[PDB]
Amino acid sequence: ERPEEVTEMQRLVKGEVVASTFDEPASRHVQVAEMVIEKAKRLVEHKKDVIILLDSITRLARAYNTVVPASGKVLTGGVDANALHRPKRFFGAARNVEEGGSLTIIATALIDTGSKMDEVIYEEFKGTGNMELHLSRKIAEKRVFPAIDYNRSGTRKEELLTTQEELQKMWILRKIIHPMGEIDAMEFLINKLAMTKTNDDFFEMMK
Amino acid sequence: MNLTELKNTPVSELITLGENMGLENLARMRKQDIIFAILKQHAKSGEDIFGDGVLEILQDGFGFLRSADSSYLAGPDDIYVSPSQIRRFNLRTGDTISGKIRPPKEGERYFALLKVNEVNFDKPENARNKILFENLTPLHANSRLRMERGNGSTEDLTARVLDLASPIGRGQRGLIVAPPKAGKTMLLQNIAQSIAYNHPDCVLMVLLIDERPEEVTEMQRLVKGEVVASTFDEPASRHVQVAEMVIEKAKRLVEHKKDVIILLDSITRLARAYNTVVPASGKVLTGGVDANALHRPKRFFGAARNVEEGGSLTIIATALIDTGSKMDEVIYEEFKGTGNMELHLSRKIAEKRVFPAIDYNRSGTRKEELLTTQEELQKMWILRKIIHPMGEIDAMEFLINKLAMTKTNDDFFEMMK
Amino acid sequence: MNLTELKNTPVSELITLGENMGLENLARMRKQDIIFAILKQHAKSGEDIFGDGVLEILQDGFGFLRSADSSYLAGPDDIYVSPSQIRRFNLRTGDTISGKIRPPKEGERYFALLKVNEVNFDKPENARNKILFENLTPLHANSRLRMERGNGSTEDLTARVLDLASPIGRGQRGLIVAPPKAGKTMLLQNIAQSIAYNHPDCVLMVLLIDERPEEVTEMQRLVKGEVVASTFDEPASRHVQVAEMVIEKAKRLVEHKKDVIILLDSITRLARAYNTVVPASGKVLTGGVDANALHRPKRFFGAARNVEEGGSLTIIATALIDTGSKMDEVIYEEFKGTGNMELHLSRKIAEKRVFPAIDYNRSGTRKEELLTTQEELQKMWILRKIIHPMGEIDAMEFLINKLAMTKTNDDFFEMMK
Amino acid sequence: MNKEILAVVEAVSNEKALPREKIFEALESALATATKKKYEQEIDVRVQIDRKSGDFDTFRRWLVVDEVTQPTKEITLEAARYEDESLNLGDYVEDQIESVTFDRITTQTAKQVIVQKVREAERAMVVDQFREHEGEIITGVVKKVNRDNISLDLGNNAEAVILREDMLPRENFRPGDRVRGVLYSVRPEARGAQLFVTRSKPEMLIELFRIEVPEIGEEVIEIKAAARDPGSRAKIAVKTNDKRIDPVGACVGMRGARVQAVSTELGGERIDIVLWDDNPAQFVINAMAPADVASIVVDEDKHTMDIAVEAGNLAQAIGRNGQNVRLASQLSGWELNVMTVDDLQAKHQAEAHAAIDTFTKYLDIDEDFATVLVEEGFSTLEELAYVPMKELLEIEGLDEPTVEALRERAKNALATIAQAQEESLGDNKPADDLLNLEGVDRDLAFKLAARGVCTLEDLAEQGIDDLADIEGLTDEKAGALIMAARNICWFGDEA
RNA sequence: UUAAACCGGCGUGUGGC
Ligand SMILES: Nc1ncnc2c1ncn2[C@@H]1O[C@H](COP(=O)(O)OP(=O)(O)O)[C@@H](O)[C@H]1O
Ligand SMILES: Nc1ncnc2c1ncn2[C@@H]1O[C@H](COP(=O)(O)OP(=O)(O)O)[C@@H](O)[C@H]1O
Ligand code: BEF
Ligand code: BEF
Ligand SMILES: [Mg+2]
Ligand SMILES: [Mg+2]
After folding, report:
1. Centre of ligand 3 from the C-alpha of residue C340, in Å
2. CB–CB of C70/C77 below 8 Å?
3. Where in the cell is it found (chain D) (predicted)?
4. Selecting from 3.40.50.300, 3.90.1300.10, 3.30.1330.60, 2.40.30.10, what CATH number does the domain A1-206 have?
5. Domain B139-416 is in which class?
């Protein structure tokens, strides 16, 4: 990303901020990536929880495809065959452990790049991750923030992520959100949540 | 100097002025291209040119100063506006800006505006500290805008009838529902002339979308004020461009506490262009219109409003019916409920050579008590009571005969006695 | 010498002339190829050939002088025009240029025009210093172009009816809306013949797009003037080529203050070709037409206009309905609102062997008061008043019977008495 | 063949930095450089590959110039008869058609030119990333310093340069320091350096004030004009629209705080804050402060101003290098004159009544009539050649012999002004030691003395270049002449 | 900083004098 973005991120949030901008080639990119992922692996081995907010995964996949040996063949979009193995390893390093610690990664996928290969990455990444979150640009151009795709967002085994009656209420709320249009759902979201302060207060106001 | 100062005059004076400037044969290139070359030479004389235009903002952040006589479209004399001005003053779309401009060095594109000297006919200090348009408080039409001329012409009735059918005021939202070959052209012509003659205080902004170029030439040099139009010579892209640009100019002028009349014909072709320039949502409505194809037309239509603080925006957009298909009628429907002012014209009576054929029955105005005095309102109520129980032809011939037998509207009241 | 001077005559005289020139067997190659070989030999005799043609500009900057008899298409006798002439005079598309030409040396392509001697039947000095076409001021039809012949033929009525239904004048924009098997061919035939016989001052330019070659041969050698056509033998590329070329020729001829009548049939096939030759915008409209597929057709249609300075361009393009699908009808719709002159023909009456079946009801002309005198306008108003309340069959049989019972139109007025 | 090139132009990643048009013009240049290798004849070959439609078709450029070396690219100024060229410049030919098609070295040339073109596109990108602030104060560290320019970095590979005239003559530099200037000129399509920052150009001070003075920026104190001398001294004239605003104590600040801060930021540059007046006379009066002038003589046509300060303050009024005057001569843009010290330094009352030697015989049919009249002035002698009879009445006794003597003296005045002009235009003076030189006639002596030498010793010490561009001599006769001059002056050993 | 020019070690075997 931009070095100004790195400086804005490092001295704004709590914790360690390691980054590798375009100043470094694919070699140093994969270096820092595997190094932070192994640090997270060790910290989970020591029974600690590690949140890894990465943006973006598509540039990481491009670097990986840049640093793989050629197998004499190319896929659809311009990606090598074994170019996805190590990205898939890095992506699936995240897991919840029985013994102690957790590794939760939130890697941003990039679409609308014009070409196929990036979209290909996205595809190869929808099936491996068990947590999707989709953001809208067609609504962002309308200066309507935040434009999260409420329809295609979801979580597998989400019943373990929330209590019983809150889960019932979220089910009913998604039932209400479904039959209305995209713009309808999004303006309803932004208006009625800015009209609220917290989330349980939002539940008690929808009453 | 000013581009419009070279634009009010035909290509002949531009040719002789370029011959004064000592350049290549000017008549060969276009007259606006002539103006570009002439301003380039004028800048070569070692002087800072003074330009003006309304601002158009692209995605990159810079701006273009589109000129009035160029129909608010892309031209070689569109002044480039560096983003630094948008950082300092944040001039939005439609802001009439006048200031110093420099010639384009080679490999550049157009003239660059150095320093703004006039922002919407006011000091630049009011540009930064100002209350916005969509931030205003919309209200109803409080002040009445009379329409009758006062000397009793034959088409003067075409104004009087409005004052007798449903009044028109500042900040109103008017629709003109009429089939083809009904008499909308001359109607809006005399409407603009009457607004200009009787009420020269307000800013007359007549609009024309997708008509004959002869109609554009007849409209530009007949009425008072600026006449920007976009005929069929321009695709839906330039149509929506000129539409949003004039609507943002009106928004800014109302922000500066001024009244703007926007006579548009027609709204149906604008809706067709909008439906042409919307992304497909994988579904179509009844008639062949996309789902989100109405959002931006509805925004453009509801931009008109009456303000508590200052200024007004009153649009009179003509609706077209009897087109054979559904989609246009659909537009009409989606537009009867948003506008608070309807006016319906008759073609079944126009074919009888009976002009003007305004539908006195389905015409009306919401909150029309704020548009006319007390006893005049009583008399209009009684007059509509008289007009109601008789037939359509009866009401219309009574209208035309007894109003041509009169000269003015209060004289008409005093003759009905 | 001139190519058309060798083109007015059949291949037989060309063969004997080539035998006079002493060349290979000429009848084997094509007759236009015969003309190419003959001009090559004529240039071999040590003389500068005199050629003429209308200019076609490619992307490279040079030009081609397409000939009239070759239907303004690519041919071996298309004179090459070096860019230096476009630098000196800047001859635009459609400019009829006549001048000295040289033979092509080997490895070259065609004849090269050395020096222009005639620019649009005028001196070359007027070519550089001249006001442009899109730079003109469009207006309405001021002068009336009468249509009746005057000796009372059976199809002479087919002209009179127009003068009785809706007048036609210079600078107008006319549409002919008719289904297949209705009578458009003979109609435009006698229209062209009447314009040529009664008004030989104007330049008759009949146009034909995608019809039978027998129809092209019947049209070329029946009417007065140049007859350029492009049948189905040519794809959409050559269709749009000949269309833009004749329209630019008309533009230049109006720039030279001359009147040009463009009788085109049909506009729907032209629109189909245009929709065939437009880039895809990733979306389709109702009926199967691209979004930007109408821009260039609309330009070609609106090229017609009446000018303040001199000359006129009046196009009569036939619209086709009852094709079963939507897209053609869509074209028709997109074309009712741009043209200011409608004329509708009946097939439901044509199947009854009732000719000519013109829709007197939906025919009309905008600003038709400038197309006819005062009292004649009163009488036409009263006549349409009489025609209205009776049925369609009633009006049409009354028309045909009482006009065949008459000889001329003013005689018809004096008989209705 | 062509389908392969179409696939390449479809597969280019930076279709936005290099769309189809730039791609096929790059292939134009590539095929030109390849034809440079195909034939030993170095010929420029445009090939207009017509990307969208078809493939390449080779041309040959004429490179119009009177020379004949490499005749594949040599055409005189008018050789445009054949092929109906009819063009002096730019007429180019298509002689060789379908030259050697793509081979491996052609692909090598195409590869290198397209990668350097991607580099040029990235240079345009950094141009765009450094632009939008043209005419604003920017921070920047330097990389290298040279005798003619210095390189500057801002971050994000933002490269710019500051030229020698853009720097101060004494501002010492060293890599790593954070210098500041203003971004003044941009060249988005240049070859070497792209962005240009300056520190000596006048308007810099303006934006300096625009970041220092809170008044400017809202245009309550409109900056009128400013003249500069880099790092040494800068004067500025300003105008205020309000009446309760004092530009002497508001733009300066509190006891010299704002102007002092601006000068310290500039690196020790003297600044003179002056109020601008709408009259050029009072403007030049106020401009040379600190100074006082009681002698003003302004001439509109000659663009001159006789602004002579009082005797004693000269060493301070003119100052070093005439700065206080020179900057003044740059503030209004006019010429001045300061010559007198003691002998009637008023320069107006002096020249009004110092004509005792000129009018010795003007009304001299009888000198005992009246003195010359200063009310009309009698101080032009050329525009005075014709005055109407409306004001020619006040002189009592203007008989006809008197006006005939006036006409005779006016003819004398024309003769004397023509003489003064011919002595003033003759700043060559070819003496007899300049005319007697063999091979140097009168005209050659005129020209040679106009070159800058008027004697014979300094002739022998100029070479062929110093004599070059002479009117009437070739370089070989030039060398012979200067050799003969050196023989007469140096080799002869005579005095 | 820029321009121009130029850019057999070893063993083996054979044969001959
Ligand atoms: N008040 C009137 N007096 C005379 N003629 C009229 C009047 N109103 C309409 N007309 C006639 O009706 C026609 C209306 O044309 P136009 O204004 O283009 O209708 P529309 O606006 O419905 O297309 C004109 O040609 C004109 O001759
Ligand atoms: N004015 C007319 N008089 C007699 N017959 C006519 C006339 N106009 C058309 N027809 C008939 O119409 C037929 C040709 O119609 P056509 O011109 O092909 O219609 P379309 O152009 O709609 O196909 C002919 O057979 C002819 O008999
Ligand atoms: F103006 Be019309 F109704 F086409
Ligand atoms: F049959 Be018709 F000519 F369309
Ligand atoms: Mg109309
Ligand atoms: Mg037909």
Report:
1. 9
2. yes
3. Cytoplasm
4. 3.40.50.300
5. alpha beta
